[PDB]
Amino acid sequence: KLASELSNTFGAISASIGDIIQRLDPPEQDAQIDRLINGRLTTLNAFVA
Amino acid sequence: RSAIEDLLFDKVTIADPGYMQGYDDCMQQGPASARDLICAQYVAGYKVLP
Amino acid sequence: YVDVGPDSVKSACIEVDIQQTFFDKTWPRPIDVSKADGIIYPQGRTYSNITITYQGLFPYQGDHGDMYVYSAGHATGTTPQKLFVANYSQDVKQFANGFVVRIGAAANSTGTVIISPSTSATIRKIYPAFMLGSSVGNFSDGKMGRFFNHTLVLLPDGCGTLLRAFYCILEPRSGNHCPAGNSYTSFATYHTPATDCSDGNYNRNASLNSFKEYFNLRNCTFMYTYNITEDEILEWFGITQTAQGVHLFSSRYVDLYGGNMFQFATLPVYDTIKYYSIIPHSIRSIQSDRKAWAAFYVYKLQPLTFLLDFSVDGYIRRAIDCGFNDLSQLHCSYESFDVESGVYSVSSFEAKPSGSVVEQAEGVECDFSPLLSGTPPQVYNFKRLVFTNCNYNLTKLLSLFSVNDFTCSQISPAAIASNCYSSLILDYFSYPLSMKSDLSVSSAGPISQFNYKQSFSNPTCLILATVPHNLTTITKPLKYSYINKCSRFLSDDRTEVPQLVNANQYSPCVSIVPSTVWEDGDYYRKQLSPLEGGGWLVASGSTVAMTEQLQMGFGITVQYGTDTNSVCPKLEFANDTKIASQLGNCVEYSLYGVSGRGVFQNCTAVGVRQQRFVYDAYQNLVGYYSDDGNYYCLRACVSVPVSVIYDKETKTHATLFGSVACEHISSTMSQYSRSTRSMLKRRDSTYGPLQTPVGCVLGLVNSSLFVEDCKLPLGQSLCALPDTPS
Amino acid sequence: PLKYSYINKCSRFLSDDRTEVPQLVNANQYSPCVSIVPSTVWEDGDYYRKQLSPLEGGGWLVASGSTVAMTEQLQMGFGITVQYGTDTNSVCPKLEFANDTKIASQLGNCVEYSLYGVSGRGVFQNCTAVGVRQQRFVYDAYQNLVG
């Protein structure tokens, strides 16, 4: 389950961080990064529980 | 180990174990047919404790 | 401007000789973060004996700093002579989030004169001088350190009891040995103890005047002075810069003994500092009266996180540099200076990435020639070019027009130019710039309502531009035109059905509308076929006057794919020197514009042949079919897990590398995890790696003892013992 | 001003004279291109260039600007920002304290207060000292004022 979530977009343009960095202007780049970060943290919280 | 314990272990469908060779069973120095979650351990940042 | 006093008495300068080789000493001074060395106290707040974490600009624990030493110049017999200084005038550094310094640490001890070490004189505290600014360059003689416009001049003047700061323009002097003169060597300042710092009259202008002898101050905007007392105790001082000005920090005023630094003062200068240098200085002391000076150090600040140990007395006494070592990581994670003994998980190694390889290509240049002549279409008549299998350089196209509007959605414009794709699509049209207010990909204007829309499934860009007077093969529309309505009447003559344009499609109304709108507000109709249920097609439009230079717009979209990505920027593959099948341990790659990293191997084939990329059930690339006639496969790369054994009863530790085995272990690594591993090396600099049944470890020593409960077990039969009690 | 004016370009040409990279302005800071641009733009579309040294990393600085006609009464703009500090909050509106009562002691209920712009409500006591001086305000690990 944790492995499958690495490919799960969180509404980010792509599941790859390096891909969204390469393709985006930095002011908008980290909006996409934060969508990804929040979802990754959420699955970890469920996992620990 | 008793033969009965081994019968149980043979009928169980569990993926091949980590530890040795561990990291080098993910790596190209092994069969191309491995499909173990143990190699995925070194992608995902997981660690399986002994 | 500031009343800086009189200009120099002379344009001539005392000759400066560079004696740098005398100053080549090695006296490194690492930061005792455990003693709060170099710690700038938090802004405006205080705490009790509680500990907290905190983020701010701080020096690294292992930073030994830069060392500078000021000294007496040349003198012989009973008189001063020429100036003997280090080459510090050439030491220009980029400003980098501020810095702090160590002043007088070696006071109350002895050293050497350095320029004439043959003296072994006792050493004393001496104050540094600095220059900061936004730009540097060479002198007329090609010399380093010339600053432009206004600079921040920081210097003690006469004795350390007076500190001065200036913000002003420096004017080079044409005298002998002077910045603009042709006998110039290197700038330096000096102090003359024989008359300066007199017991009944300290020369408050000594240093300033010797400065003035080499430069003329012009336009002096700022000037500040400070009163300082003499005390050989170690002082800390630092400089940072924010939008609020320059901030000066010192331990002297508040925490002379603990060394915590407090915002001593601020400066009104808002000009961003790009460069930082130290000002050279020499003492004009008599040869027999020479006095050695204590070493001076500089450290750089960075946005780091620390665990802070506040005293009930409000002083920071201890601190933990979280990113220094894996051990420090644990202390920070438990917000404590005493972590319970056990074995803990720590951050893993990045597996050492290497040089890239690619399989991009092949194709021919894109023939953008449809854009080079004729009249561009009305907003409902768009031309489209699909590009596949071809190479491009869009900046060549940019040179052909003046761009008056460039905006890209979901992609940086730089990236869309550099990206490789399964397709590239360009839509192009005439478009008056009077209508540019109504056009964006998200616009509510009639142009997007009825004439054009773009899908948001694909990243997009938009360009508005006009024709140069030498591009006359391209020609103007009689008038610019657009459809400002598109709907169909219901057959019952009471209602009407609107028809907004579909993304990536012509509006249906184009079938009745002429190639141009003959008059503004013209409308047209067609009866709908009986297969459509009857009713009438309706459309209307508007026009814009023709302009001196043709105005046009463009729409750009791109399409993602894998083995279909034959559209690429023009590429050059020289000196890779190799691509697929060459490793490496981890390598960067791109295949037809698909980025990734991994290691490749020449494995066997699986189908379907010629699909190139092969994927997992989790959409992870598995491997790649290639043009060497070889199927290759991809293992990504394998990361190394790490763990740390810790025993607070002995205050010792040891480490575990997981299952990696000692064949990949080396004394240092580029792999990499945290900035140091040296705490392990305190014992393990002298020992080889040890393989174990779980995996390779360091510092565990094979004693082959049998113990029923180590309280530190490593799993399996592995165990470890703390060293014995005090 | 003779005309209102602004910089509409500030980028660096690559040393190979083809590639070019823009230099957007930093918040709250002067753009670097001000080093070559004249105090006003003399004519609309004026531009200038600077060769850059290998110390500067090479290439050419390039900049340009545009103008707007002057008006009978000057037209102006302002930007205003504020900063909240902790023990540095000495900027305030002039006090209205006149014609009121002695402060701050009550001791008393947990009365609303502002000290140097730090709003809150609470009750005070004349306890002893904890360090450290001249930081004024004292805080807890939970970001709550202590004293």
User: What tokens appear for C490 in the block?
Assistant: 């219901």
CB of C205 less than 8 A from some CB of B: no
Secondary structure of C85-151 in HEC code, one letter for each residue:
ECCHHHCEEECCCCEEEEECCCCCEECCCCCCCCCCCEEECCCCEEEEECCEECCCCCCCCEECCEE
User: What tokens appear for C500 in the block?
Assistant: 């907004």
CB of C233 less than 8 A from some CB of A: no
Amino acid identity, residue D118? V
Q: Which of C48, C148, C272 sits opposite D130 (nearest CB)?
A: C48
CA distance D143 to D130: 17
CA angle C330, C333, C338 (to 5 degrees): 60
* Cβ within 8 Å of residue C572, ≥6 positions away: none
Q: Which of D28, D53, D86 sits opposite C45 (nearest CB)?
A: D86
Is the CB of B46 less than 8 angstroms away from the CB of A2?
yes
Is the CB of A2 less than 8 angstroms away from the CB of B44?
yes
CB of A27 less than 8 A from some CB of C: no
Enclosing H/E stretch for A5: helix A2-5
CA distance C113 to D146: 53
DSSP state of C718: B
CA distance C622 to C634: 6
Pairing of β C652-656 and β C640-647:
antiparallel
CB of A6 less than 8 A from some CB of B: yes
Q: State the burial class of residue C589 (Cβ atoms within 10 Å of its Cβ: 0-12, 13-18, 19+).
A: buried
Chain C nearest C-alpha distance from D51 (Å): 13
Query: What are the residues facing C652 on neighbouring strands?
Result: C647
Residues in A closer than 8 angstroms to B40, CB to CB, are: 3
CA distance D52 to D50: 6
CA distance C40 to C36: 9
How long, in residues, is chain D?
A: 147
Is the CB of C595 less than 8 angstroms away from the CB of A25?
no
Q: Which chain D residue lies closest to C311 (C-alpha atoms)? A: D131
* Inter-residue contact C305 to C37 (CB < 8 Å): no
Q: Which of A4, A19, A25 sits opposite C595 (nearest CB)?
A: A19
Q: Which of D66, D64, D72, D69 is nearest to D36 (CA)?
A: D64
Q: State the burial class of residue C276 (Cβ atoms within 10 Å of its Cβ: 0-12, 13-18, 19+).
A: buried
* Inter-residue contact C380 to C507 (CB < 8 Å): yes
DSSP state of D24: P
Residues in A closer than 8 angstroms to B37, CB to CB, are: 3
CA distance C621 to C632: 12
CA distance C184 to C666: 52
Q: What is the DSSP string of C135-198?
A: -EE--TTS-S-EE-SEEEEEEEESEEEEEEEEEEEEEE--STT-TTSTT-----EEE-TTTTTB
Chain B nearest C-alpha distance from A3 (Å): 6
CB of C598 less than 8 A from some CB of A: no
CA distance B24 to B32: 12
Peptide bond into D104 cis (omega under 30): yes
CA distance C348 to A39: 22
Do B and D make contact, counting contact as 3+ CB pairs within 8 angstroms?
A: no
CA distance C448 to C463: 15
Q: What is the DSSP string of D52-66?
A: --GGGTSSEEEEEEE
CA distance C628 to C612: 12
- Pairs of residues, one from chain B and one from chain C, whose beta carbons lie less than 8 Å apart: 59
Helix (H, G, I), strand (E, B) or coil at B22: helix
CA distance C333 to C485: 64
Torsion over CA: C678, C680, C683, C688 (sign): negative
Q: Which of C509, C555, C512 is nearest to C383 (CA)?
A: C555
Q: Which of C348, C585, C350, C657 is nearest to B46 (CA)?
A: C348
Per-residue CA distances from C546 to C401, C439, C471 (Å): 18, 18, 17
Is the CB of B46 less than 8 angstroms away from the CB of A6?
no
DSSP state of D17: S
CB atoms within 10 A of CB D114: 11
Per-residue CA distances from C369 to B47, C365, C366, C372, C385 (Å): 58, 11, 9, 5, 10
Is the CB of C410 less than 8 angstroms away from the CB of A13?
yes
Per-residue CA distances from C266 to C154, C345, D96, D136 (Å): 13, 44, 30, 19
Amino acid identity, residue B20? M
By a Cβ cutoff of 8 Å, what residues of chain B touch chain C?
Answer: 18-24, 26-28, 32, 39, 42-43, 45, 47, 49-50
Q: Which of C345, C601, C633 sits opposite B47 (nearest CB)?
A: C345
CA distance C647 to C713: 12
Enclosing H/E stretch for C416: helix C413-418
CA distance C73 to C293: 12
* Inter-residue contact C197 to C261 (CB < 8 Å): no
* Inter-residue contact C715 to B50 (CB < 8 Å): yes
Q: Which chain B residue lies closest to C602 (C-alpha atoms)? A: B28
When scoring B16, B20, B21, B23 by the number of chain C Cβ atoms within 10 A, the one with the most, hence best to mutate, is: B23
DSSP state of C272: P
CA distance D13 to D23: 11
* CA C329 to chain centroid: 24
Chain C nearest C-alpha distance from B11 (Å): 24
CA distance B22 to C656: 14
User: What tokens appear for D62 in the block?
Assistant: 């390039």
* Inter-residue contact A23 to A10 (CB < 8 Å): no
Enclosing H/E stretch for A33: helix A26-48
Q: Which of C184, C66, C57, C80 is nearest to C130 (CA)?
A: C66
Q: Which of A4, A18, A24 sits opposite C618 (nearest CB)?
A: A4
DSSP state of C283: E
Model resolution, angstroms = 4.5
* Inter-residue contact C446 to C521 (CB < 8 Å): no
CB of A48 less than 8 A from some CB of B: no
Enclosing H/E stretch for C267: strand C262-267
Q: Which chain C residue lies closest to B34 (C-alpha atoms)? A: C635
Q: How far apart are the first and last CA of chain B?
A: 19
Dihedral, CA of residue B25, residue B27, residue B32 and residue B34, to nearest 10: 40
Is the CB of C599 less than 8 angstroms away from the CB of B28?
yes
CB of C314 less than 8 A from some CB of D: yes
Dihedral, CA of residue A11, residue A12, residue A15 and residue A21, to nearest 10: 180
Amino acid identity, residue C138? N
Token pair 């979802």 in the structure block, residue: A39
Per-residue CA distances from C630 to C358, C505, C563, C594, C602 (Å): 15, 43, 16, 19, 7
CA distance C574 to C419: 19
Question: In the complex, which subunits touch B with 3 or more CB pairs below 8 angstroms?
Answer: A, C
Token pair 């807890």 in the structure block, residue: D140
Q: Which of C411, C618, C620 sits opposite A23 (nearest CB)?
A: C411
Residues in C closer than 8 angstroms to B21, CB to CB, are: 659, 661
CA distance C296 to C146: 23
CA distance D138 to D147: 5
* Inter-residue contact C700 to C690 (CB < 8 Å): yes
CA distance C529 to C656: 80
User: What tokens appear for C526 in the block?
Assistant: 């067609």
* Inter-residue contact C43 to C148 (CB < 8 Å): no
Phi, psi dihedrals of residue C681, rounded to the nearest 5°: -65, -20
Helix (H, G, I), strand (E, B) or coil at B20: coil
* Inter-residue contact C85 to C23 (CB < 8 Å): no
Helix (H, G, I), strand (E, B) or coil at C346: strand
CB of A3 less than 8 A from some CB of B: yes
